[PDB]
Amino acid sequence: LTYTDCTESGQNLCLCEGSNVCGQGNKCILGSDGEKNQCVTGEGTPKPQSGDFEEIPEEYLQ
């Protein structure tokens, strides 16, 4: 599980203040340009998880 940069205000389970995860029970308020992010108490929504693959034989699929 890699936590990555929060991409919108109200997310959590993402990197908010520098390289620090903004955890459950908190939410990230994104800074505009020249502003810093803040991890504050709140009801966050987890940042959504972030091919290509050759199809495998049908027998493996049931």
Place this chain on the structure above:
Amino acid sequence: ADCGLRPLFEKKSLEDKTERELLESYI
């Protein structure tokens, strides 16, 4: 029985390209 011994390496007395970096760290 032989867990941890790789058929293409240890079982043929062959080393992989970077294994020696690991062993060198144990000194």
Place this chain on the structure above:
Amino acid sequence: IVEGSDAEIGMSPWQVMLFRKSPQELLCGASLISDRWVLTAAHCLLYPPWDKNFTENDLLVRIGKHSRTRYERNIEKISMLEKIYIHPRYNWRENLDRDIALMKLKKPVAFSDYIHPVCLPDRETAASLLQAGYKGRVTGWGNLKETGQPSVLQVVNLPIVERPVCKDSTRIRITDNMFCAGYKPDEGKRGDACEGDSGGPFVMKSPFNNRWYQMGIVSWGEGCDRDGKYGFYTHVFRLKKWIQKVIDQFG
């Protein structure tokens, strides 16, 4: 795997790829620990914040692989699962403590040049090998950078980091069921696991009996390969009693 290289054919024959049946995609890495048992991270199977709660019918394991995307006919083996066991004290709400799960194959697999189990450490192995500065090896088909994907299995060697340095590196609470690895910012070498490498093995070679032992499971990280930050691994030896009791009861 960030800052690694292509694996040699057969260099990690316990490497397993966890694979979703529908849609068909890579989910996580795992390891082959016997002819019928695969070890992975619990968060690869159960992670409520992402509405993830895979059942045995949702998943396949692929063993003996090198190419990330090819169907490697007559080389890889694709296995269905009989059952999944997650550690009962797995803590997804706070810090992924006890991030460990076992998956039992429907049928035992034959070993081959490309498929062979890794050892699990015992008391003596853990004491000898789990020390700061000793390097282990991580493999996987995960992202090549934090923000892309490899054509073939990747490998990177990383040193174990002293427990105080791991703790100072993060505000997340670290337990004795975790260890961290990676180079320090001064060290002129870098590298890390990354998304998609999760669940995969952190292994070390015994200088006493030439065998490979799985000391950790790729667990979690704040970013991938960032300066001053380190990868966290499940401490396999610490959780070995649970592993043993699952296999003894359900094997």
